[PDB]
Design a protein around this ligand. Structure first.
Ligand code: NA
Length: 436
């Protein structure tokens, strides 16, 4: 069905009989699509809960290492902790409605008080167990297409991003402010979430500029076109672009100027580094400005964003999701060679450097190759990418002088044919460690 009932405040909404849901969004074949693929995952959760509970982080007690950065942050929390507690009541099936009403009617500082959550009806005082389940359950509850808060650029659940069209929910900004408060709470209280935010989403929270590499993790299709513009320098040839980007916003198209007079200004050589930069800048910022500001205002109230300034995108995602034990056997068993084999010296050397690495250095290698620290239920075989499930792959691509290159959307590592164990090691270590 369809329908079109009305609100106490006279706003029109829809009653999807095909789902059994009420939304502000016109319930398309795609909305019904999105909602069912969301549904499944909501029921694939109680079996998965044990997986997510295996997540860990360090025990509270050189320098400029994730671990010090973390224990320093833990301290900043404990120092700003307020006495007494805040008890939130929820029901297993009312988890989102409930948490929203109670945390939005609370002043931000009350939320730094020690948490406790109550599962209505059900016997058992809190302790860590119900907060763990709460944080995880609600981390997914927020992605219900019903609320209009999110969408996915690619295949099924690939590349979580904010729905530019979220403005169709008059409370889109209250909800994105709540998500901000909530994700902040998780970091203040040490608990973990599995929302699915990407490294470039974590960069904004950190006030770090996303790059041309970073679009490969959201729009691999779009990242190539831009790579085509940069690499195929061109003889101008079969190309005519202007400094513009249109955007379909709830049907009506609108042409945005990347710069002033942009519709007028043609893309050319030398000129195109400016444009590539701007386009890249447009892609993360377009349609999601107020949603993202409300997130962040929402986040800042609870745990000041300035407290994360010394983390890079990877350290922060890892602070929110937690660490898993990377089993080297599942990794190796679930790895494919391209222009290489198992016996290639660069492969035998690659596994030798991965054998050295402690778990965090390996997690760091996983984030690099796949765009996240989160290893899925079922491990290295159940590795997913922009084109559905894709296994970890290493390809012989390069010049020896090059640094290894990742393809997070396909989980592929372009590993050049280095001349030595020590060359390859340093290069891999370098690519992974970045500049910390
Ligand atoms: Na991936």
């Amino acid at each position: 069905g369809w329908e079109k009932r009305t609100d106490p405040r006279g706003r029109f909404y829809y009653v999807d009989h095909n789902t059994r849901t009420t939304t502000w969004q016109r319930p398309t074949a795609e909305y019904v699509r999105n909602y069912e693929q969301w549904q499944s995952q909501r029921n694939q959760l109680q079996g998965a809960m044990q997986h997510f509970s295996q997540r860990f982080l360090y025990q509270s007690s050189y320098d400029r290492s994730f671990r010090w950065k973390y224990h320093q942050f833990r301290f900043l929390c404990h120092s700003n902790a307020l006495p007494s507690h805040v008890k939130i009541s929820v029901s297993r099936q009312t988890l989102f409605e409930d948490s929203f009403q109670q945390i939005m009617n609370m002043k931000p500082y009350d939320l730094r008080r020690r948490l406790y959550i109550i599962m209505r009806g059900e016997e058992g005082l809190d302790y860590g167990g119900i907060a763990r389940e709460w944080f995880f359950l609600l981390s997914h509850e927020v992605l219900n297409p019903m609320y209009c808060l999110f969408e996915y650029a690619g295949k099924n659940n690939y590349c979580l991003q904010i729905n530019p069209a979220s403005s169709i929910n008059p409370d889109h900004l209250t909800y994105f402010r709540f998500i901000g408060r909530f994700i902040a709470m998780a970091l203040y209280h040490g608990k973990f979430i599995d929302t699915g935010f990407t490294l470039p989403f974590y960069k904004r929270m950190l006030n770090k500029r996303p790059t041309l590499k970073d679009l490969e993790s959201i729009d691999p299709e779009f990242y190539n076109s831009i790579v085509w513009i940069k690499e195929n320098n061109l003889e101008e040839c079969g190309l005519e672009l202007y400094f513009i980007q249109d955007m379909e916003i709830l049907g009506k198209v609108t042409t945005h100027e990347l710069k002033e007079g942009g519709e007028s200004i043609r893309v050319t050589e030398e000129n195109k580094e400016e444009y590539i930069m701007l386009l890249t800048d447009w892609r993360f910022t377009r349609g999601v400005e107020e949603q993202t500001k409300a997130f962040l205002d929402g986040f800042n109230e609870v745990a000041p964003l300035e407290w994360l300034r010394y983390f890079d995108e990877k350290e922060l995602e890892l602070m929110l999701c937690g660490m898993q034990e990377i089993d080297m056997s599942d990794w190796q068993k679930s790895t494919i060679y391209r222009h290489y084999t198992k016996n290639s010296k660069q492969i035998q050397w690659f596994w030798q450097v991965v054998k050295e690495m402690d778990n965090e250095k390996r997690i760091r290698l996983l984030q690099f190759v796949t765009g996240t620290c989160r290893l899925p239920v079922g491990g290295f075989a159940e590795l997913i990418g922009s084109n559905g499930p894709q296994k970890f792959c290493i390809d012989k691509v390069g010049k020896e002088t090059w640094l290894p290159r990742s393809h997070t959307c396909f989980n592929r590592l372009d590993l050049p044919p280095y001349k030595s164990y020590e060359q390859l090691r340093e290069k891999l270590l370098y690519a992974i460690e970045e500049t910390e």
